[PDB]
Amino acid sequence: DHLFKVLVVGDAAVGKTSLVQRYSQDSFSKHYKSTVGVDFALKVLQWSDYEIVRLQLWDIAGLERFAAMTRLYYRDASACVIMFDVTNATTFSNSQRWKQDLDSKLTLPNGEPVPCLLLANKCDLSPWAVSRDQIDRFSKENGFTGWTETSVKENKNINEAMRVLIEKMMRN
Amino acid sequence: EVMLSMLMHSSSKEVFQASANALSTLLEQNVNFRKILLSKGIHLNVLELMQKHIHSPEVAESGCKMLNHLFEGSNTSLDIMAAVVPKILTVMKRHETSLPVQLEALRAILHFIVEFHHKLNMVKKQCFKNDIHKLVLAALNRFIGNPGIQKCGLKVISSIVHFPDALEMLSLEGAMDSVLHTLQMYPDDQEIQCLGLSLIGYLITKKNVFIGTGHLLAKILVSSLYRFKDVAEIQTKGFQTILAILKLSASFSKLLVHHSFDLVIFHQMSSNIMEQKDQQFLNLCCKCFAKVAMDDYLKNVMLERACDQNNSIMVECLLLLGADANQAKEGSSLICQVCEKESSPKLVELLLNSGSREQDVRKALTISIGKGDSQIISLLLRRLALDANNSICLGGFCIGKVEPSWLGPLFPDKTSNLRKQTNIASTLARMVIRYQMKSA
Numbered sequence: 162d163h164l165f166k167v168l169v170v171g172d173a174a175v176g177k178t179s180l181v182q183r184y185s186q187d188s189f190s191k192h193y194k195s196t197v198g199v200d201f202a203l204k205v206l207q208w209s210d211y212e213i214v215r216l217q218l219w220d221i222a223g224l225e226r227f228a229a230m231t232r233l234y235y236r237d238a239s240a241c242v243i244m245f246d247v248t249n250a251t252t253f254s255n256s257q258r259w260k261q262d263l264d265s266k267l268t269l270p271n272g273e274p275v276p277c278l279l280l281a282n283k284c285d286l287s288p289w290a291v292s293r294d295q296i297d298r299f300s301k302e303n304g305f306t307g308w309t310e311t312s313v314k315e316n317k318n319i320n321e322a323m324r325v326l327i328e329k330m331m332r333n
Numbered sequence: 334e335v336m337l338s339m340l341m342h343s344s345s346k347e348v349f350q351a352s353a354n355a356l357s358t359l360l361e362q363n364v365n366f367r368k369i370l371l372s373k374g375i376h377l378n379v380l381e382l383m384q385k386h387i388h389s390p391e392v393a394e395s396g397c398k399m400l401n402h403l404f405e406g407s408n409t410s411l412d413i414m415a416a417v418v419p420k421i422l423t424v425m426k427r428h429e430t431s432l433p434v435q436l437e438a439l440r441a442i443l444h445f446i447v448e449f450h451h452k453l454n455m456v457k458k459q460c461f462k463n464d465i466h467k468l469v470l471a472a473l474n475r476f477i478g479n480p481g482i483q484k485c486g487l488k489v490i491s492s493i494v495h496f497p498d499a500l501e502m503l504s505l506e507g508a509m510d511s512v513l514h515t516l517q518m519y520p521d522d523q524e525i526q527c528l529g530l531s532l533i534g535y536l537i538t539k540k541n542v543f544i545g546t547g548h549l550l551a552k553i554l555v556s557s558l559y560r561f562k563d564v565a566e567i568q569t570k571g572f573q574t575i576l577a578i579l580k581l582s583a584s585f586s587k588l589l590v591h592h593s594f595d596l597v598i599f600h601q602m603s604s605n606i607m608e609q610k611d612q613q614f615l616n617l618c619c620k621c622f623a624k625v626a627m628d629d630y631l632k633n634v635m636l637e638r639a640c641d642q643n644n645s646i647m648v649e650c651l652l653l654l655g656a657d658a659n660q661a662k663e664g665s666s667l668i669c670q671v672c673e674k675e676s677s678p679k680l681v682e683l684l685l686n687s688g689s690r691e692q693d694v695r696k697a698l699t700i701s702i703g704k705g706d707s708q709i710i711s712l713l714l715r716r717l718a719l720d721a722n723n724s725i726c727l728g729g730f731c732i733g734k735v736e737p738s739w740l741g742p743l744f745p746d747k748t749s750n751l752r753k754q755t756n757i758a759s760t761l762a763r764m765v766i767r768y769q770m771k772s773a
Contacts, residue, residue, distance in 0.1 A: 162415060164377060186372065198337055201374035205412050211455070213412055215377055233341055 164215040165330065167240040170263070172255040173223045175246040175282050179313035181218045184323060190314035196222040199234065206327065216327070226255065232266045240330045241267070244280035244311075247289050253299070260303055276306035276329045278322065285312040336375070343382055346392045353379070357399040368407055375403065376413070380420040390431040393424050397437035404445050411456050417445060422463045425472075432479060435472045439485040442469075446492050457496050466493055466502055474511040480525065483515055487528040494535045504538050509546065512536070516553050526557050527567055534574030542582040550578070551589045558597045565614065568601060572617050579624040586624065590631045595638050598622055599647050606646075606757055616764065623768040632656040640671050645679040649758035654765060658687040666693035672701050678708045685716045698730060707738040714743055 171177055177196055182188035185202040204216040221234060235241070243259045245252040260277065269275055279300060284290045293310070300308040306329050309322040335352045342348045360366050383396045400421065409417070425438040442465075473486035490508060493499050512529055519525040533550065541547070554571060561567045578585050586594075598618060605615050625631065636656045639647050652658065658667055665673070668684045685694070694717060701709045718726040725743065 164381065164416075198334075199340070201336075201378070203372075203374040203377070213415065215416060217374055217378065 162213050162215070164217070165239040166217045166219065166237065167242060167330075168234060168238050169218060169220045169242050169244060170259045171223055171244040171280075171282070172246065172249070172252040173226075175223075175244060175252060176313045177220050177223065177244065180244060180280070180282070180311070180319060181220045183313055183316050183319055185218060189316050195224065196220065197224075198222055208327070208331070214327070214331070223255070226258070230262050230266065235263065235267045238267070238275070240275055240326070242278050242280060242326065244282050246282045247284060247292070248286065257299070257303075260305075271333070273333070274304075276326060276333070277303075278326045279303075279305050279308035280322065281308075281310040283312055283314070284310045285315050285317065336370070336373070339382075340378075343385060346386055346389055349382065349386065350391055350395050353395045353399045357395070357402045360399075361402045364406065367403065367405070371403065371407070376400070377416050380417065383424050384420065387424070387427055390428045390434050393428050394431065394434040394437055397421065397424070397434060397441050401437055401441040401444060404441065409445065411449075411452050414445070414456050415459065418442070418460055418465070419463050422465050422468065426464075426468055429468070429472065432476060432482065435476075436479070436482045436485065439469065439472070439482060439489055443485055443488050443492070446489070454497075458498060461496060461498050461502060466490075466499070466506060469493075470506050470508060470511060473515070477515070477518055480519060480522065483519065484524055484528070487512070487515070487525065487532060491528060491532055491535075494532065500536075500538070503536065504540060509533070509536050509541055509550075513549060513553055516557065520556065520560060523561065523564070523567070526560070527570065530554070530557055530567065530570045530574055534570075534577040537574075537577050537581050539581060542578070542584065547578075547582075547585060548588050551585070551592050551594075555589065555592050555594050555597065559593075562597070562600055563604070565611065568597075569611075569614050569617070572614070572621055576617060576621050576624075579621060583624070583627070586631065587628070590625065590634055595635055599639065599642075599644055602761065603646060616768075619761070619764050620768050620772075623765050623772060626654060626765065626769055629656065633660045636660060637667070640667055640676075640680065640684075641674065643677055643680070645677055645683075646758055646761075648680060648683055650762040650765065652683060652687050653759065653762035654769075658684050658689050659693070661693065666690075666696065668693050668697045669700060672697045672709055672713075673704075676709075678712055681709055681712055685712065689716075691717075695730060698732070702732055707736070707741070710739050711742050714740065719743055 169177065169181060174193065174195070176193065178194070178200065179189065179191065181200075181202045182191070185204050199222060200220050202218040202220070204218060206214050206216065208214050219234065219238075241263055243256045243263075245256040256279070263277070264274065267275060279296065281293075281296065291310070296308065299305075307322070307325055309318055309325070311318045311322060313319070335356050339349055339352050356370075360370070379396055379399065383393055386392045400417075421438055421441060425435060428434045469486060469489050473483060473490075477483065490503070490512075493503065512532055516526060516529045533554070541550075554575060558568060558571045575589075598621075601618055605611060605618075625635075632651070632654070633656060636648070636651050636658075637660065639651060661667060661669075666689075668681065668689055671680050671684060681697075694713065698710065698713045698717065701713060714727065717730070718728070720726070723745075725740075727740075
C-alpha cells in the first residue's frame with residue numbers, strides 16, 4: 162500500500178471543487194460557489210491485488226493568483242494537475258501561469274518534473290467545446306504528460322483521465 | 334481554518350498540539366462534525382503527520398486522543414483499518430514508556446477494531462503480523478497503575494481472542510499470568526473482574542491446566558466469585574469459565590473443593606431458587622457440580638463441610654446422589670458433630686433416615702442429652718426405640734432422666750399428618766444426576 166498527494170490548480174470559477182467532489186464524494190454539477198481556501202478530498206483505489214493506493218486531492222483556491230504561490234503546498238507533493246474552463250482564453254493564460262509557477266517551484270527526488278495533465282473543464286457547453294486542434298499546440302509545446310477533455314456535470318471522462326494520470330504517476 | 338493552520342505549519346509541534354486539542358474538543362462537544370472531517374481527509378493525513386513528527390510524545394498523545402474522539406460512534410471499512418491500525422501501532426511502539434500515549438492509543442484501537450471474509454482475513458493476519466498483541470501485553474503488564482488503561486487492555490485482548498490465529502499466539506506470550514495478576518491487584522472493582530473472568534475461560538489451554546497455574550487460577554476464581562455472590566453477570570461468567578476448565582481437564586476441582594468452592598455453589602443454589610429463576614444459570618451450575626460429583630472423596634469432604642454449616646437443602650441432594658452418611662474420621666461421627674453444633678432438626682432427620690450406624694447414634698443421644706434440647710433427642714429416639722408393633726423399647730441407654738417433652742412426638746398423635754411438599758432438593762438432585770448420567 163502507498164499514499165500520494167495530488168494538487169489541483171486552475172483559474173477561478175472553473176468548478177474547481179466540482180471535479181474533486183465527483184471523483185471522491187460522487188457529487189457532480191450542483192451550485193457554483195467560490196472556494197475561499199484550500200480544501201481536501203480522499204480517494205482509495207484498488208489498482209492491484211494486495212496493492213491499495215490512497216490519494217489526497219488538494220484543490221488550491223485560484224482567487225489569489227497574484228499572491229505568491231507558496232511552495233509549502235507543493236512541498237512533499239507527488240503529483241499535480243491544471244484544470245481550466247474552456248470558455249475563456251484568460252483561463253488558458255492562467256493555466257500557462259500555473260505551469261510556469263509549478264515548473265519554477267516544484268521538485269522531485271529524481272529531479273524530473275512531476276506528471277501534469279491538461280483538463281479541458283466543462284466541454285458539455287457551447288461554443289468553445291471541442292477545439293482540440295488549438296489545444297494541441299500547448300499540449301505538445303508545454304511537454305505535459307497528458308491532455309484530456311472533461312465535463313464535471315456529466316462526468317464523461319473524469320474517471321479514465323484520472324486513471325491514466327495515476328498510472329503515469331506510479332509509472333515513475 | 335484550524336485544519337488549514339495544521340496543514341500549513343506541519344514543521345512545528347506546538348501548532349499541531351494546540352490545534353489538534355482544539356478540534357478534538359470541538360468534535361467531542363458536537364457529534365455532527367463527526368464523519369465530516371472524516372469525509373474531508375483528516376485521518377491518514379494526521380497519520381502521515383505523526384509519521385513526520387515522532388521524536389516527541391505530546392504530539393503522539395494528542396494525535397491518538399484526536400483519533401479516539403474522531404472515530405467514536407462510527408464504523409470504518411477494511412481499507413481504513415489497513416490505513417489506520419499499522420501506523421498507530423508503530424506510533425505506540427515508538428512511544429511505549431509514556432502512559433498517556435499508551436492510554437489514548439489503546440482507547441483508539443478499542444473504538445476502531447470492531448468476499449468480505451476473504452478480504453478481512455488478510456487484514457486480520459497483517460494486524461497480527463504488526464505485533465499488536467506483544468505491544469498491548471507489554472503495556473498492560475509493565476505498568477499496572479492507572480486502572481483505566483488496564484480495563485482498556487482487557488477490552489482489547491478480548492477483541493483479540495475471538496482472531497483465528499490469536500489463541501496460540503496469545504498462549505505463547507503468557508497472557509494468563511498478566512490477567513490473573515491484574516485480577517489479584519484489582520479485587521474490589523467490578524468491570525476489571527467482569528472482563529477478566531470472561532477472558533480466563535477463553536484463554537484456557539491444556540498447557541496451563543497443571544499445578545503452578547491451575548492452583549492459582551482456582552484460588553482467584555473462588556475469590557472472585559465470593560467477592561460478588563449476588564451479581565448474576567459475574568457469577569454466570571465465572572461458572573462458564575469454570576465449566577470450560579472442567580471440560581478441558583478433569584484434574585481440576587481437586588483444589589477448588591479444597592479452596593472453599595462449596596460456599597459458592599450452596600449460596601447460589603439457595604439464592605437462585607429463592608430469587609428469580611434463571612434456567613441457563615442454574616443448569617450451568619448443576620453441570621459444573623455434576624463434573625465435581627466424581628471422585629467421591631471430594632463428595633465426602635463436601636458433605637463434611639455442608640453438614641458443618643446449616644445447609645438443610647443441600648444435604649438431601651448430596652445424600653440422593655450418594656455419599657453415605659458414615660464418613661466419620663473416627664474423631665466423631667457425622668451425626669455426632671452435626672448434633673454438637675446446634676444444627677437444625679431437619680439435618681439430623683436426614684442423617685438418621687439415611688445409613689447411620691447405631692453406636693454413633695447412641696453417642697449422639699448422650700451428647701444431645703448433655704446439651705438438653707428436646708427436639709433433637711426426640712428425633713433421635715424416633716429411630717433408636719420405636720416399633721409396626723406399636724411399642725417402645727427405650728432400654729439399655731443410660732439417660733440420666735426423662736421428661737415429657739422428650740417423648741412427645743414419639744406417641745402417634747393422629748390429630749394431623751404432616752405434609753412436606755418441598756421437592757426443591759429432590760429436583761436439584763434429579764437434574765444433577767440427569768446431567769451426570771447423560772454426560773457419561
